[PDB]
């Protein structure tokens, strides 16, 4: 999309997370410390999503001035909120009400 | 050709009581034709072409 766009998009911090081995929080902490953008894209599942945000609030990314957007499966259910997500989380989900 | 433009200024020590009325008794000397009159009698009399 970026190549075929007159509008200017700034790309940065394209690093991924290899959350597979134990005691990776120290590695995650440096990975979480390399983000310097007002909005950060995150793509995980409902079970995996809560693990990442346990470190996100530790450094202090969550709050005003920072926005996180996740796919539909991160929320999982329309009402069953695990309360493990930062205030202001916005996501796109499949239509179910109509 | 002029390459560094910055006007003059009646500097004063920071945080001085007079710092506001001086900057308004200069802006009022431009409009009345005063500082265009001192310019006439001191700086713009012609002696050589």
């Amino acid at each position: 999309t970026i190549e075929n766009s007159f509008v200017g998009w700034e790309l940065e911090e394209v690093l991924l997370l290899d959350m597979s081995l134990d005691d990776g929080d120290s590695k995650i902490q440096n990975q979480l410390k390399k983000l310097q953008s007002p909005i950060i894209l995150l793509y995980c599942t409902k079970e995996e999503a809560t693990y990442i945000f346990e470190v996100a609030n530790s450094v202090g990314l969550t709050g005003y001035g920072y926005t996180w957007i996740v796919p539909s499966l991160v929320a999982g259910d329309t009402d069953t909120v695990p309360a493990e997500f930062p205030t202001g989380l916005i996501s796109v989900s499949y239509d179910e009400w109509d | 050709e002029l390459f560094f433009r910055s006007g003059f200024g009646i500097g004063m020590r920071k945080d001085s009581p007079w710092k506001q009325n001086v900057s308004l008794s200069i802006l009022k000397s431009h409009e009345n034709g005063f500082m265009e009159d001192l310019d006439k009698t001191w700086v713009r009399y012609q002696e050589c072409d």
Binding site: - | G9, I10, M12
Partner: protein, 48 residues
């Protein structure tokens, strides 16, 4: 020892960090002054 520098004093970023300036009372610039050479003239005889 002085409270008001009534003189031609340019305003720039180094001085403005310690003292307070006013609104400019003259707008200027920097220009170069060089000696004017003689215009000369070549007309004394019509055999030129």
């Amino acid at each position: 020892q002085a409270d008001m520098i009534v003189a031609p004093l340019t305003i720039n970023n180094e001085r403005a960090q310690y003292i307070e300036f006013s609104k400019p009372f003259k707008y200027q610039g920097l220009t170069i002054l060089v000696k004017k050479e003689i215009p000369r003239s070549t007309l004394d005889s019509f055999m030129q």
